[PDB]
Write an enzyme that holds these catalytic residues in place. Structure first.
Site, PDB file in Angstrom:
ATOM      1  N   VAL A 103      -7.129   7.131   8.952  1.00 29.13           N
ATOM      2  CA  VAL A 103      -8.337   7.883   8.689  1.00 29.13           C
ATOM      3  C   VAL A 103      -8.950   7.443   7.337  1.00 29.13           C
ATOM      4  CG1 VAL A 103      -7.735   9.983   7.396  1.00 29.13           C
ATOM      5  CG2 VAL A 103      -9.026  10.150   9.568  1.00 29.13           C
ATOM      6  N   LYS A 151      -0.255  11.805   4.717  1.00 26.96           N
ATOM      7  CA  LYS A 151      -0.564  10.879   3.619  1.00 26.96           C
ATOM      8  C   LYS A 151       0.724  10.243   3.163  1.00 26.96           C
ATOM      9  CE  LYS A 151      -2.377  10.976  -1.222  1.00 26.96           C
ATOM     10  NZ  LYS A 151      -3.206  11.721  -2.243  1.00 26.96           N
ATOM     11  N   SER A 158      -7.970   5.361   3.174  1.00 27.02           N
ATOM     12  CA  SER A 158      -7.029   5.225   2.053  1.00 27.02           C
ATOM     13  C   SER A 158      -7.766   5.213   0.720  1.00 27.02           C
ATOM     14  CB  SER A 158      -6.219   3.936   2.210  1.00 27.02           C
ATOM     15  OG  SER A 158      -6.934   2.830   1.698  1.00 27.02           O
ATOM     16  N   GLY A 209      -2.997   6.958  -1.971  1.00 25.98           N
ATOM     17  CA  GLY A 209      -2.313   6.631  -0.726  1.00 25.98           C
ATOM     18  C   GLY A 209      -3.184   6.615   0.526  1.00 25.98           C
ATOM     19  N   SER A 210      -2.629   6.101   1.628  1.00 22.56           N
ATOM     20  CA  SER A 210      -3.364   6.000   2.885  1.00 22.56           C
ATOM     21  C   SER A 210      -3.042   7.202   3.775  1.00 22.56           C
ATOM     22  CB  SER A 210      -3.068   4.674   3.596  1.00 22.56           C
ATOM     23  OG  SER A 210      -1.711   4.545   3.988  1.00 22.56           O
ATOM     24  N   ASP A 241      -8.283  18.693  -2.995  1.00 20.46           N
ATOM     25  CA  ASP A 241      -8.038  17.905  -4.235  1.00 20.46           C
ATOM     26  C   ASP A 241      -8.192  18.565  -5.600  1.00 20.46           C
ATOM     27  OD1 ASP A 241      -7.615  16.076  -2.288  1.00 20.46           O
ATOM     28  OD2 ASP A 241      -9.549  15.042  -2.488  1.00 20.46           O
TER      29      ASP A 241
END
Ligand SMILES: CCCCCCCCO[C@@H]1O[C@H](CO)[C@@H](O)[C@H](O)[C@H]1O
Length: 325
Positions: free
Chosen positions: A26, A46, A28, A29-30, A155
């Site tokens: 989806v 993730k 990118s 971590g990726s 986030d």
């Protein structure tokens, strides 16, 4: 310990519990989207990139896990699962984080819909802020919503950044996030970016056009000699009347925007105060606007070795308890 399987994805070998099916990159971590067969949820998995490559990487990994483990609120992204294929600390190299697969983000609306969306943001921010955490980068791409318009805070744009951040003030208060919410709210109501600055100084220019140049009271609180001298050389512009900026908006929304987009951070409304504003009368429920447990951020002050940050991280992986569904 669950049975894992391995699968080549994003040019590395992902190794995940078999409960997570049909991994699909989806970005990118990726991150891969997946289906969690144990819960029946669509989730994001993730795989951290180079989590322990350096002391900074390692501390960052530990921060991100600590933060995600702490966040337990309907309007904030949380941790559904965290895992490693490692069977011991010695083998511990990789960290995978699992969260709800958020299908869209906020990146014009009706006033009812804005009420509902901003209520959810504020509810989450009341929670975050109660843990003495400052988001500092709220913006539409950090706000996920599903098909029932349920919103979660997640986030390079500076359009939503409080002016004191743009000025590298430090000593930020939590109402830097409230500034961001005012910017998002304005945009949802108007369909237009409130302060679409072309560059860094332009962003400040646009901001001051709306909210005015600092008054005498705010000037008293500015320690910087260079800032003060520049500010007092400016052609004093007054605060614009938001009632004439947000034409045809709900006057309660305009009043809330006035309380959020105050130049002085000490005079901005808090998340808890905003939830009590009449704009949200149809959603506000003091019984279900919870605060967070205290969050021990002492690790931020620490300068530790890679293996120490790793061990601490391994501790947190091992202690993780999934939420009830
Ligand atoms: C010319 C541009 C001036 C922008 C003024 C930004 C004022 C922000 O507000 C300030 O922010 C600080 C950071 O938390 C505080 O320590 C202060 O008490 C407060 O007044």
């Amino acid at each position: 310990r669950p049975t894992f399987y391995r699968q080549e994805l994003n040019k590395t070998i992902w190794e995940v519990p078999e409960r997570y099916q049909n991994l699909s990159p989806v970005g990118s971590g990726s991150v891969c989207a997946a289906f969690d067969t144990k819960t029946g949820l669509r989730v994001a998995v993730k795989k951290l990139s180079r989590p322990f490559q350096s002391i900074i990487h390692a501390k960052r990994t530990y921060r991100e896990l600590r933060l995600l483990k702490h966040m337990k609120h309907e309007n904030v992204i949380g941790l559904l699962d965290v895992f490693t294929p490692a069977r011991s600390l010695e083998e511990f190299n990789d960290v995978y984080l699992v969260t709800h697969l958020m299908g869209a983000d906020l990146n014009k609306l009706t006033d009812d819909h804005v009420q509902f969306l901003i209520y959810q943001i504020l509810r989450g921010l009341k929670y975050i802020h109660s843990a003495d955490i400052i988001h500092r980068d709220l913006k539409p791409s950090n706000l996920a919503v599903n098909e029932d318009c349920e919103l979660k805070i997640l986030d390079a744009t500076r359009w939503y950044r409080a002016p004191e951040i743009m000025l590298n003030w430090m000593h930020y208060n939590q109402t830097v996030d409230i500034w961001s919410v005012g910017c998002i709210m304005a945009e949802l109501l108007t369909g237009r970016t409130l302060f679409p600055g072309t560059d860094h100084i332009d962003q400040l220019k646009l901001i001051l056009r709306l909210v005015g140049t600092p008054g005498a009271e705010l000037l008293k609180k500015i320690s910087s000699e260079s800032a003060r001298n520049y500010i007092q050389s400016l052609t004093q512009m007054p605060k614009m009347n938001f009632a004439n900026v947000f034409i045809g908006a709900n006057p309660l929304a305009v009043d809330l925007l006035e309380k959020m987009l105050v130049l002085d951070s000490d005079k901005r409304i808090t998340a808890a105060q905003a939830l009590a504003h009449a704009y949200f009368a149809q959603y506000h429920d003091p019984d279900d606007e919870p605060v967070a447990d205290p969050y021990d951020q002492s690790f931020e002050s620490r300068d530790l070795l890679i293996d120490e940050w790793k061990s601490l991280t391994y501790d947190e992986v091992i202690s993780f308890v999934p939420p009830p569904l």
